[PDB]
């Protein structure tokens, strides 16, 4: 990402770019998004939350007018839009704000209302883990034994994000889809479930819990989840394909390199602190450098698709290249798709062109599994 869409504040512009990308799949048009953004001063998180929260209100009011005619199709779309409008506001909401969980629950209710009015068979689930239950969504046809795709996010996602990132598209290509929030993600920190050293357990928990029609099970990790899935894929062999955007074998090194008045960055860092369960982002970083353990990628044997943008930290691209070179040497079926700027998909997690990366992923996955 290195020219602006709307804001000079880089964090805000990236978020804005990302919110636009979502609208390509479900929810708000570029029209709504520029309308909302016209009320947002550059680098002002308070304006951001206010405008996005108000748009959600407008949309719920629309739902109430249109109900009076049971325009079913339309009600689902408005509910999705309202949901992702609250999601946008949440991105820059401080966990210490009383509004935070109120709004997080409001987002969740709206997501289910969109699904209630849709012809999508999505259901809420809870995966048992470490005494507690991890929140997730699942979409599974009752009548067909389909191959499964599990979607895992990074440090800025909830199960709702996993939906438009891959899960919905996965379902539309006839896969059973699970999208579960691991500790540290979504609202897990709110119940004492913070980022943990090894994601293998949580991910195996999900598989332990899932009674899979077929054995053809793929896992896809975005952002942070490129590290979490690397971890699962190393040790757990019922995973039959691995998609990572981007794959990470050593987070310690990613942090080390990265972190060697911006009110937007401040709220971001605070949310991270909350997800790690620490008092500082600074302390959180140390926790990582401290405990995060390097994946033994020479132990990965699975068909792999690595997705990486040209607007991507050079350390992320390095680790991607390492894994590519190593898997190729060893004759693992590996593909490294670089997304150039021209492609319009070069931003982290391919948010600036979800549609393209969906085609890439599923053309590849169809080949690996069906074929």
Binding to a copy of itself by CB under 8 A, coded x per residue (else -) over 327-366, reads --------------xxxxxxx---xxxxxx--xx-xx---
Residue 31 Cβ, how far from Mg ion at the closest point, in Å? 11
Backbone conformation region of residue 349, classed left if phi is above 0, alpha if psi is from -120 to 50, else beta? left
Among 34, 128, 340, 367, binds Mg ion (CB under 5 A): 340
State residue 127 phi and psi, 5-degree precision.
-100, 125
Q: Which is nearer to a copy of itself, 76 or 188 (CB)?
A: 76
Q: Which has the closest alpha carbon to 365: 188, 150, 192? A: 150
Distances (CA, A) of 280 to 51, 203, 267, 268, 271: 28, 27, 12, 12, 10
Contact characters 86-125, Mg ion, x per CB under 5 A: ----------------------------------------
174 counts as binding a copy of itself under rule CB under 8 A:
no
Phi-psi region at 309: left, alpha or beta (left = phi > 0; alpha = psi -120 to 50): beta
CA distance 264 to 42: 10
10 sits near a copy of itself (criterion: CB under 8 A): no
Q: Residue 19 or residue 307: which is nearer to Mg ion going by CB?
A: 307
Rounded CA separation 33/17 (Å)? 10
CA distance 289 to 368: 36
Work out whether 306 is an interface residue with Mg ion (CB under 5 A): no
Nearer to a copy of itself, 5 or 252 (CB): 5
Which of 5/288 has CB closer to a copy of itself? 5
Taking CB under 8 A as the rule, which mask of x and - marks residues 75-104 in contact with a copy of itself? --x---------------------------
Tell me the closest approach of the beta carbon of residue 339 to Mg ion, in angstroms. Answer: 5
Choice between 69 and 261, CB closer to a copy of itself: 69
Question: Scanning residues 13 to 72, which ones bind a copy of itself (CB under 8 A)?
Answer: 17, 20-21, 23-24, 28-35, 38, 55, 58, 62, 69, 71
Q: How far is the CB of 218 from a copy of itself (least distance, A)?
A: 17
Burial 214-233 (b: 16+ CB within 10 A, else e): eebbbbbbbbbbbbbbbbbb
Nearer to Mg ion, 254 or 308 (CB): 308
Nearest Cα neighbor of 125 from 110, 112, 106, 142 is 112
Nearer residue to a copy of itself within complex by CB, 312 or 346: 346
Q: Is 126 in the site for a copy of itself (CB under 8 A)?
A: no
The region of 35-43, 132-140, 218-226, 338-346 touching Mg ion under the rule CB under 5 A is 338-346
Q: At what angle do helices 45-67 and 99-116 cross, to 10 degrees?
A: 30
List for the chain the helix, strand, coil content (%; round to 5): 55, 15, 35
Residues with Cβ within 8 Å of residue 175, at least 6 apart in sequence: 146, 147, 148, 149, 218, 365
Beta strands 304-309 and 334-339 are parallel
E strand segments, 106-175:
123-129, 132-139, 148-152
Name the site residues for a copy of itself (rule: CB under 8 A): 3, 5, 17, 20-21, 23-24, 28-35, 38, 55, 58, 62, 69, 71, 73-74, 77, 341-347, 351-356, 359-360, 362-363, 367
């Amino acid at each position: 990402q290195d020219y602006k869409i709307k804001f000079n504040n880089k964090d805000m512009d990236f978020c804005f770019n990302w919110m636009l990308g979502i609208g390509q799949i479900i929810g708000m048009s570029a029209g709504e998004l520029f309308y909302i953004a016209s009320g947002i001063r550059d680098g002002n998180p308070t304006d951001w939350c206010k405008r996005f929260n108000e748009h959600a209100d407008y949309l719920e009011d629309e739902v109430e007018r249109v109900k009076k005619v049971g325009y079913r199709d339309l009600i689902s779309h408005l509910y999705f839009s309202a949901c992702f409008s609250i999601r946008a506001a949440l991105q820059f909401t401080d966990p210490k704000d009383s509004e935070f969980m109120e709004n997080f629950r409001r987002m969740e209710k709206l997501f289910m209302l969109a699904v209630d009015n849709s012809k999508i068979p999505l259901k809420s689930i809870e995966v048992p883990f470490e005494g507690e239950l991890l929140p997730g969504y699942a979409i599974i046809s009752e009548d067909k034994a389909q191959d499964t795709l599990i979607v895992v996010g990074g440090g800025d996602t909830s199960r709702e994000d996993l939906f438009y990132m891959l899960g919905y598209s996965g379902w539309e290509h006839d896969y059973n889809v699970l999208m579960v929030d691991l500790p540290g993600q979504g609202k897990n920190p709110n119940q004492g479930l913070h980022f943990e050293v090894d994601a293998r357990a949580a991910i195996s928990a999900i598989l332990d819990w899932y009674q899979a029609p077929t054995e053809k099970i793929a896992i896809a990790g975005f952002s942070g989840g490129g590290y979490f899935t690397a971890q699962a894929v190393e040790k757990d062999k019922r995973i039959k394909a691995w998609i990572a955007s981007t794959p990470i074998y050593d987070v310690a090194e990613v942090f080390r390199i990265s972190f060697s008045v911006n009110k937007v960055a401040e709220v971001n860092l605070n949310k991270y602190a909350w997800q790690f369960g620490q008092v500082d982002f600074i302390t959180s970083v140390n926790e990582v450098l401290e405990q995060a353990q390097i994946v033994d990628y020479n132990k990965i044997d699975v068909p792999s698709l690595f997705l990486v943008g040209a607007g991507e930290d050079s350390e992320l691209m390095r680790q991607s290249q390492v894994l590519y070179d190593n898997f190729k040497q060893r004759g693992i079926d590996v593909t490294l798709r670089k997304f150039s700027s021209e492609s319009g998909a070069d931003a982290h997690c391919q948010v600036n062109n979800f549609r393209l990366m969906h085609y890439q992923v599923f053309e590849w996955l169809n080949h690996i599994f069906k074929k």
